[PDB]
Amino acid sequence: AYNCAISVICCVFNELKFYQSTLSEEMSQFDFSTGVQ
Amino acid sequence: EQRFNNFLKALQEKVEIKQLNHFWEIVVQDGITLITKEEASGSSVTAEEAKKFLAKDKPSGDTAAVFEEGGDVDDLLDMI
Numbered sequence: 001a002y003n004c005a006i007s008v009i010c011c012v013f014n015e016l017k018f019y020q021s022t023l024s025e026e027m028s029q030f031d032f033s034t035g036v037q
Numbered sequence: 038e039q040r041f042n043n044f045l046k047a048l049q050e051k052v053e054i055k056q057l058n059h060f061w062e063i064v065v066q067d068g069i070t071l072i073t074k075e076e077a078s079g080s081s082v083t084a085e086e087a088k089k090f091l092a093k094d095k096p097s098g099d100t101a102a103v104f105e106e107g108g109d110v111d112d113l114l115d116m117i
Contacts, residue, residue, distance in 0.1 A: 012116050017099055019109045 042074035049088060065089070 009018055031037060049072065052061040065072070073085040100108035 013112075017112075019112070 038076040039074065042076065045072055053091065
């Protein structure tokens with residue numbers, strides 16, 4: 001509850017008084033043929 | 038004379054600090070006749086002028102309402 005109160009204090013009460021490639025293509029094709037990423 | 042002059046000062050400040058609906062406004066609008074000192078002139082007239090208009094207005098101060106645990110609620114109602 002106090003963490004949620006801190007969160008809601010983060011915006012309201014901003015003041016005081018807080019209320020206390022070809023090679024890449026080839027590699028991909030080889031990986032696809034191998035079926036291993 | 039001067040005794041009732043300081044009495045007038047005391048009663049005027051007492052009604053001022055008092056808050057009423059039919060407050061000294063009725064008294065003042067009828068208190069157009071000698072609500073202030075008159076024993077030595079000069080100071081008498083200027084004091085009468087000062088006391089006639091009761092002197093300003095400006096609101097300030099946080100958490101000053103009834104039941105302060107609602108004053109934060111009053112502060113709570115300031116975001117929408």
